[PDB]
Amino acid sequence: TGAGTPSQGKKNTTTHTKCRRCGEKSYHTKKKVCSSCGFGKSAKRRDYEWQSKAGE
Amino acid sequence: GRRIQGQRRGRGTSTFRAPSHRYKADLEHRKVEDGDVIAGTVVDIEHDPARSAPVAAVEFEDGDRRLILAPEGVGVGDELQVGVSAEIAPGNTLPLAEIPEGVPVCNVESSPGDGGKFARASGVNAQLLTHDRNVAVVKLPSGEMKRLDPQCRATIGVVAGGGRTDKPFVKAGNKHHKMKARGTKWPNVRGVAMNAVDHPFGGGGRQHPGKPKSISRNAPPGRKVGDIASKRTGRGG
Amino acid sequence: MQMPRRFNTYCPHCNEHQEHEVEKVRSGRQTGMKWIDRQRERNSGIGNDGKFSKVPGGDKPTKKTDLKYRCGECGKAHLREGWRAGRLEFQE
Amino acid sequence: ARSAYSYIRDAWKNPGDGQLAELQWQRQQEWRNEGAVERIERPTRLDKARSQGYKAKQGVIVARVSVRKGSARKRRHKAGRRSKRQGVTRITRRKDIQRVAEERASRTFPNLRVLNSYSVGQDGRQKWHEVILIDPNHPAIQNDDDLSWICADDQADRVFRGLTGAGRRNRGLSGKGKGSEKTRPSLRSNGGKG
RNA sequence: GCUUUACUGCAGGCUGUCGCUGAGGACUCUCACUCCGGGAGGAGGACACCGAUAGCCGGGCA
RNA sequence: ACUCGUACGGUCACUGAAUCCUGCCCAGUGCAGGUAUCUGAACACCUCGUACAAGAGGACGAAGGACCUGUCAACGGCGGG
RNA sequence: GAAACAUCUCAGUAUCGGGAGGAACAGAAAACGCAACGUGAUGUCGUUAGUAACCGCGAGUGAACGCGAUACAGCCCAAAC
Ligand SMILES: [Cl-]
Ligand SMILES: [Cl-]
Ligand SMILES: [Cl-]
Ligand SMILES: [Cl-]
Ligand SMILES: [K+]
Ligand SMILES: [Mg+2]
Ligand SMILES: [Mg+2]
Ligand SMILES: [Mg+2]
Ligand SMILES: [Mg+2]
Ligand SMILES: [Mg+2]
Ligand SMILES: [Mg+2]
Ligand SMILES: [Mg+2]
Ligand SMILES: [Mg+2]
Ligand SMILES: [Mg+2]
Ligand SMILES: [Mg+2]
Ligand SMILES: [Mg+2]
Ligand SMILES: [Mg+2]
Ligand SMILES: [Mg+2]
Ligand SMILES: [Mg+2]
Ligand SMILES: [Mg+2]
Ligand SMILES: [Mg+2]
Ligand code: NA
Ligand code: NA
Ligand code: NA
Ligand code: NA
Ligand code: NA
Ligand code: NA
Ligand code: NA
Ligand code: NA
Ligand SMILES: [Sr+2]
Ligand SMILES: [Sr+2]
Ligand SMILES: [Sr+2]
Ligand SMILES: [Sr+2]
Ligand SMILES: [Sr+2]
Ligand SMILES: [Sr+2]
Ligand SMILES: [Sr+2]
Ligand SMILES: [Sr+2]
Ligand SMILES: [Sr+2]
Ligand SMILES: [Sr+2]
Ligand SMILES: [Sr+2]
Ligand SMILES: [Sr+2]
Ligand SMILES: [Sr+2]
Ligand SMILES: [Sr+2]
């Protein structure tokens, strides 16, 4: 069985959904954590300094 | 290289853990204040998934229903006693001090009242030898002379399910089923059959270990494989 | 080669010829208090120590002459340029 | 004449001698069974406490904190590192145990602000420090001339910013002259070379 | 990437020493500390653990 | 974690059903045990040095090594004359 | 980067953990040490200076006192009684 096209057919699981906190389709319903804002993991909003260039 | 299989083991993941949820009871001795006035009738004889040997379901005088490490000969309706003034019969648990010499015991304790550590596998027995006010020397199934406290409790008789080792598994399918009820990864791929990155014995054009199999005690985890701190190897000599 | 223990030669101190005695320079003991010894203890930390992580090199097939020319009268010594000699023995 | 306080002080000059030797051997046994941060009603070293800024007033809290002895609890490198940066065992933290204690205390009391701290001994594996914390919202402090400065907005989270005495001493700010080139006005303003 | 008796180092193990740590070169003890016991209490005991340091081993890893 | 586990256990390795069998070698390497003697760091201690310190030397000597022994279903070996 | 590379360098940089304010931090000498019959809390700007100092003494790294300016401001406990 190929890892390409025939393996795509199994893909009917819902993971990332609309987030209650930020509104992005990044809330992992199995993990109960937002990959964008970090709702579920932290009280503080997910933000990192690498999201922009070092001198910006 | 990559961590060897023995290093993945310690992480305690699903693949390596024992199916605890499917286990019946943590076979420990009962707690008596003193006096011995604790006894009970055996209700049933069940199978312990953890040890492949039978276990007796006993009901006590004080309403307590518990499973106990059953020695050979124990049946339904039998009355077992636990304590200091207990009868010297098979299935009864009393300290080594009260048990006479030359009598096969099982489910022996290390420290008094711990619940039982030694001689618990299918058909084995510890042999009580010497008596004192200080030391009761017990001969464990490995052939070792364990100097113990006389206050350490032990059940009389040999453990049930004797001679389990006698019949071969014959086919891999039978080993599979047994292994599925323990905390072990099976099947075993030889290190010599792996790649260099995966095991100290991996690599080469042909299958053979790279260095001598006997490894030092001081060796680090990831290198400590093969024959660990062997005093000798082989059959002859 | 063989070399006389005592012979006449120039003393740069006395400004005149005198009977000099020759001795092989015996190595003096180290104090461990020099600057280099202090830098060794200082600059050495976790991992490689750079220059202090090196080991002394090899040898040349034949060593040069390492002598001391002691004057007979004033008692002061001087140094001369040495020459390659496999073995240096003294005469009397 | 000598104060009664001067006797508590003279006793602590040598915590392994006299009656205090016997007292520590006894107290530490109960302390080892106590928590990480334990509020105590009265300071063990009254002289030091009062000298540091303590007063028997409403809103002046004291607490004992136990922190582990030794170097950094460091993990080894999981990626490539040059020899110098391959250490684990000999690496130590840049904040002293006292400062670790003050922070653990301040976190346990989110409303209070750290005034100062002092050592109350150590055994084989841990060190104990008593931290004096103040309630910047109690009118008993807002009106106290010798303590009302800690009520100002810019004194909020003073321990996490290293504004404690133990903080300033650990930052290399003791000496006013030679040696304090890379420390004053701040370590961060000096490129982190102190 | 991999290997080793390549170079240099880093974990890890073993070992001495210091602190915890106490009473009377082999030895007793109980009070710290440890383990067992629901507990009363039992075992062990200034050792072990832990912190620090020193020597050995150390492609397990960089 | 193994472990609701306890040597008829479970960990670490090699070989790979059955049948007939599985020789010789412990010098090297590995592992392990022992050890008069030798070698063996630091702390404490002793001499020198310094009104102190750096430092030099000594005594004691752990594991380890030397040396001795065991071990090849341990790495491996089984020739020329 | 050092024309390899280990100390060194990149650099206390990138990135990470915690936190304040409208500014932060520092701050009224156990200072300095143009050694004086001298200066006088603290930041900052110009200079001192690529100087002193560091460094497989290689490549490289690199202050301070002072001076000229800006602005200036000095106080509270602990204890004694
Ligand atoms: Cl099995
Ligand atoms: Cl010569
Ligand atoms: Cl605070
Ligand atoms: Cl001046
Ligand atoms: K580098
Ligand atoms: Mg059990
Ligand atoms: Mg078998
Ligand atoms: Mg399984
Ligand atoms: Mg296999
Ligand atoms: Mg393969
Ligand atoms: Mg490998
Ligand atoms: Mg093969
Ligand atoms: Mg093979
Ligand atoms: Mg600033
Ligand atoms: Mg416990
Ligand atoms: Mg490598
Ligand atoms: Mg095969
Ligand atoms: Mg380069
Ligand atoms: Mg060069
Ligand atoms: Mg620099
Ligand atoms: Mg200066
Ligand atoms: Na230095
Ligand atoms: Na707080
Ligand atoms: Na510094
Ligand atoms: Na051999
Ligand atoms: Na062969
Ligand atoms: Na280059
Ligand atoms: Na290169
Ligand atoms: Na350098
Ligand atoms: Sr198909
Ligand atoms: Sr699916
Ligand atoms: Sr979480
Ligand atoms: Sr951020
Ligand atoms: Sr228990
Ligand atoms: Sr148990
Ligand atoms: Sr191999
Ligand atoms: Sr044989
Ligand atoms: Sr240094
Ligand atoms: Sr080093
Ligand atoms: Sr040569
Ligand atoms: Sr806050
Ligand atoms: Sr051998
Ligand atoms: Sr002024």
Curated annotation (Swiss-Prot), chain A:
Span of zinc fingers (C4-type): 19-37
Biased composition (Polar residues): 1-16
Chain segments annotated as coiled-coil in the UniProt record: none
Region Disordered, residue ranges: 1-25
GO cellular component, one term: cytosolic large ribosomal subunit
Record-listed Zn(2+) binding positions: C19, C22, C34, C37
Cofactor names: Zn(2+)
PANTHER family associated with the record: 60S RIBOSOMAL PROTEIN L37, RIBOSOMAL PROTEIN L37
Family matches, as NCBIfam families: PRK04179.1
Role this protein plays: Binds to the 23S rRNA.
Protein family according to the UniProt entry: Belongs to the eukaryotic ribosomal protein eL37 family.
Name of the featured protein: Large ribosomal subunit protein eL37
The species this protein was found in: Haloarcula marismortui (strain ATCC 43049 / DSM 3752 / JCM 8966 / VKM B-1809) (Halobacterium marismortui)
Gene, per the UniProt record: rpl37e
UniProtKB/Swiss-Prot annotation, chain B:
UniProt keyword annotation of Heme present: no
One Pfam assignment: Ribosomal_L2
MF terms (GO), sorted A to Z: rRNA binding; structural constituent of ribosome
GO CC term, one of those recorded: cytosolic large ribosomal subunit
Domain of life of the source: Archaea
Keywords: Ribonucleoprotein, Ribosomal protein, RNA-binding, rRNA-binding
GO biological process: cytoplasmic translation
Region (Disordered): 199-237
Assembly and interaction partners: Part of the 50S ribosomal subunit. Forms a bridge to the 30S subunit in the 70S ribosome. Interacts weakly with protein L37Ae.
Other facts: This protein can be partially incorporated into E.coli polysomes in vivo, indicating it can replace the endogenous protein.
Function description: One of the primary rRNA binding proteins. Required for association of the 30S and 50S subunits to form the 70S ribosome, for tRNA binding and peptide bond formation. It has been suggested to have peptidyltransferase activity; this is somewhat controversial. Makes several contacts with the 16S rRNA in the 70S ribosome.
Assigned protein family: Belongs to the universal ribosomal protein uL2 family.
Protein name: Large ribosomal subunit protein uL2
Swiss-Prot record, chain C:
PROSITE patterns in the record: RIBOSOMAL_L44E
One annotated GO molecular function: zinc ion binding
ZnF start-end (C4-type): 11-74
Residues annotated for Zn(2+) binding in this entry: C11, C14, C71, C74
UniProt cross-references to InterPro entries, sorted A to Z: Ribosomal_eL44, Ribosomal_LSU_eL42, Ribosomal_zn-bd
Pfam assignment, any one: Ribosomal_L44
GO cellular component, one term: ribosome
Assembly, per entry: Part of the 50S ribosomal subunit. Interacts weakly with protein L15e. Binds the E site tRNA.
Stored NCBIfam families: PRK05767.1 (NF004425)
Similarity section: Belongs to the eukaryotic ribosomal protein eL42 family.
Protein known as: Large ribosomal subunit protein eL42
Organism: Haloarcula marismortui (strain ATCC 43049 / DSM 3752 / JCM 8966 / VKM B-1809)
Swiss-Prot record, chain D:
Alphabetized Pfam families for the sequence: Ribosomal_L15e
GO CC annotation terms, alphabetical: cytosolic large ribosomal subunit
Matching Gene3D superfamilies: Ribosomal protein l15e
InterPro entries the record matches: Rbsml_eL15_core_dom_sf, Ribosomal_eL15, Ribosomal_eL15_arc, Ribosomal_eL15_CS, Ribosomal_uL23/eL15/eS24_sf
Keyword terms of this UniProt record: Ribonucleoprotein, Ribosomal protein, RNA-binding, rRNA-binding
Stretches for region Disordered: 71-92, 162-193
One biological process term in Gene Ontology: cytoplasmic translation
A GO term for molecular function: structural constituent of ribosome
Quaternary structure note: Part of the 50S ribosomal subunit. Interacts with protein L7Ae and weakly with L44e.
UniProt xrefs under PANTHER family: LARGE RIBOSOMAL SUBUNIT PROTEIN EL15, RIBOSOMAL PROTEIN L15
HAMAP family in the cross-refs: Ribosomal_eL15
UniProt record similarity statement: Belongs to the eukaryotic ribosomal protein eL15 family.
Protein name (Swiss-Prot/TrEMBL): Large ribosomal subunit protein eL15
